[PDB]
């Protein structure tokens, strides 16, 4: 029965909302992720050969081959002009001269432990929530698991077959807060990553 949207839909929208938002300003390049490695088509060998002084010569050749009283200061927020808050060809424009066979993966949706609605996106390993093409099956699972933690993804193989069991995560919720100017905090360190 379509009561499934009472568990789902809300997250599906949060992720659709963020799809438009994250396209505009990223938190990271997908290509920089260790599991998304393949997205980057390019390499790093061009660097030990690269000499920044040789750049002008090239640009020249290119151009040649053309014939409470809280005042919001711009740098800080001290606690018209200077926004006041109370609550009690020119070089100038942009220059870029040196630039210029199909698998089916089934998604079984679980709601109130049992009851499964199964949607298939033979569209390869494309992310049902953020449209992104994960290209590789290992990547898709990591992508889903980490970029869509409002859900719980469990991979089941079968020769028919392959399926991702999607459930609703039950343990969701240095963050952001309503601050006027400077704020006193309780000092505390945290090591999020540390690789040998």
């Amino acid at each position: 029965h379509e009561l499934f949207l009472q568990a789902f839909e809300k997250p599906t929208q949060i992720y659709r909302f963020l799809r438009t938002r994250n396209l505009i300003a990223p938190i990271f390049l997908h290509r920089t992720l260790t599991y998304m490695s393949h997205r980057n088509s390019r390499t790093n060998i061009k660097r030990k050969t690269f000499k920044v002084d040789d750049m002008l010569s090239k640009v020249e050749k290119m151009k040649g081959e053309q014939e409470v009283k809280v005042c919001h200061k711009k740098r800080k927020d001290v606690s018209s002009h200077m926004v006041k808050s109370y609550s009690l060809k020119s070089t100038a424009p942009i220059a870029k001269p040196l630039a210029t066979q199909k698998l089916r993966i089934f998604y079984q949706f679980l709601y109130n432990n049992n009851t499964r609605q199964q949607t298939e996106a033979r569209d390869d390993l494309h992310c049902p929530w953020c449209t992104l093409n994960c290209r590789k099956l290992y990547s898709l699972l990591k992508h889903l698991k980490l970029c869509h933690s409002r859900f719980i993804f469990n991979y089941v193989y079968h020769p028919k077959g392959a399926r991702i069991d999607v459930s609703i995560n039950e343990c969701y919720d240095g963050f952001a807060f309503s601050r006027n100017g400077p704020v006193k905090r309780t000092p505390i360190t945290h090591i999020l990553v540390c690789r040998p």
Binding site: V78, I94, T100, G174, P187, I191
Partner: protein, 392 residues
């Protein structure tokens, strides 16, 4: 009230970032400073204790208070050694204040003297620029609040942020201010007793607020300045005209906020503007802009070259992200999928900050380690996943 929505949307994205940090970094340390800092500068020294699983790195931080006493801070960062692992979420001693010196106003910028890194210049909200020797003050502060700047330097009528010590000339310090002037102090000779020092020279070129100022790295007589002029100026101390610079470049389409000279090239420098782009300049021919680094979604306030790599550059602004650029990557062929993420020149995006990044510093001892401080009081000591820049 879209700003109240913007808050949750930020935190949903901070969660996503967190969750993926293991796949983007070799290191992430996140620390909430008691009071936020408007400055960050990795000190050049390293303590490498005998048979320990880490090294001691020090930072020149500062405060910004809401009706409280301000300090010139020196904290210590414990960074793991290559063989060693160690993971925490502090109860252990990893990041902690070593010295807290009394400061009269919020520290705009704090920069050490390359020649003697015990000497730290500071940009204060009050007109005057102060110089402190951290060895000359106690490690535990005076509760009187009594700030005794080792030297006071007058010449500016307003506060500013640009601050530069001449590497090749000891004691030569430059300041940029909202008063359109650049002041030049020489403390080397003329150290004496007399606590107040008046500027040797004052550069009255710019037509708006002077955002930044930096010396050139090989010529002791050359320096650059950027203002809300939308211009970059190349000055020669040697010249007698303090109103006309050697060159006045129409650098950007908006307020230029920062400049940084390449430590490997005697020609290359970069500029960060409000125009959301980083511009690349060659001193040899200033009539041509070499390239415009596009990706920032808002004003850029800090542009800094990587000490360890000639082609690596980083920028931080009001889009809460810090971008890392590789010039060797400029105009590389990308797959449509590859292109999707960003220009080839864009190497990395640091999405760990939930607020505007005030300053950042590249660690001079550990390649690819960066310290980025934001207004939300957070200080991150991060280092991107080696696979991003390394090839097997």
């Amino acid at each position: 009230f879209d700003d109240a929505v913007e808050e949750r949307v930020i935190n949903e994205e901070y969660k996503i970032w967190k969750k993926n940090t293991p796949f983007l970094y070799d290191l992430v340390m996140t620390h909430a400073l008691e009071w936020p800092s408007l400055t960050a500068q990795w000190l050049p020294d390293v303590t490498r204790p005998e048979g320990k699983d880490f090294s001691i790195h020090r930072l020149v931080l500062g405060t910004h208070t809401s009706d409280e006493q301000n300090h010139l801070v020196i904290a210590s960062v414990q960074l793991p050694n290559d063989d060693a692992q160690f993971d925490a979420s502090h109860v252990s001693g990893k990041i902690e204040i070593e010295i807290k010196i009394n400061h009269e106003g919020e520290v705009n910028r704090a920069r050490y003297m390359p020649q003697n890194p015990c000497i730290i210049a500071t940009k204060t909200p009050s007109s005057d620029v102060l110089v402190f020797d951290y060895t000359k003050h106690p490690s535990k502060p005076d509760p009187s609040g009594e700030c005794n700047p080792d030297l006071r330097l007058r010449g500016h009528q307003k506060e500013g942020y640009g601050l530069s010590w001449n590497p090749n000339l000891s004691g030569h310090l430059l300041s940029a201010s909202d008063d359109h002037t650049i002041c030049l102090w020489d403390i080397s000779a003329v150290p004496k007793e007399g606590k107040v020092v008046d500027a040797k020279t004052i550069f009255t070129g710019h037509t708006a607020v002077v955002e930044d100022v930096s010396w050139h790295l090989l010529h002791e007589s050359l320096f650059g300045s950027v203002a809300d002029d939308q211009k970059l100026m190349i000055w020669d101390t040697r010249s007698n005209n303090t109103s006309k610079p050697s060159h006045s470049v129409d650098a950007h389409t908006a307020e230029v906020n920062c400049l940084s000279f390449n430590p490997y090239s005697e020609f290359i420098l970069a500029t960060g503007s409000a125009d959301k782009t980083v511009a690349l300049w060659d001193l040899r021919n200033l009539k041509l802009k070499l390239h415009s680094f596009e990706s920032h979604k808002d004003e850029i306030f800090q542009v800094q070259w990587s000490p360890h790599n000639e082609t690596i550059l980083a920028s931080s602004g009001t889009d809460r992200r810090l971008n890392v650029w590789d010039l060797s990557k400029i105009g590389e062929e990308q797959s449509p999928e590859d292109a999707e993420d960003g220009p080839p020149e864009l190497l990395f995006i640091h999405g760990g900050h939930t607020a505007k990044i005030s300053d950042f510093s590249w660690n001079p001892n550990e390649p690819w380690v960066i310290c980025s401080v934001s207004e939300d009081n957070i200080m991150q000591v991060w280092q991107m996943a080696e696979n991003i820049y390394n090839d097997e």
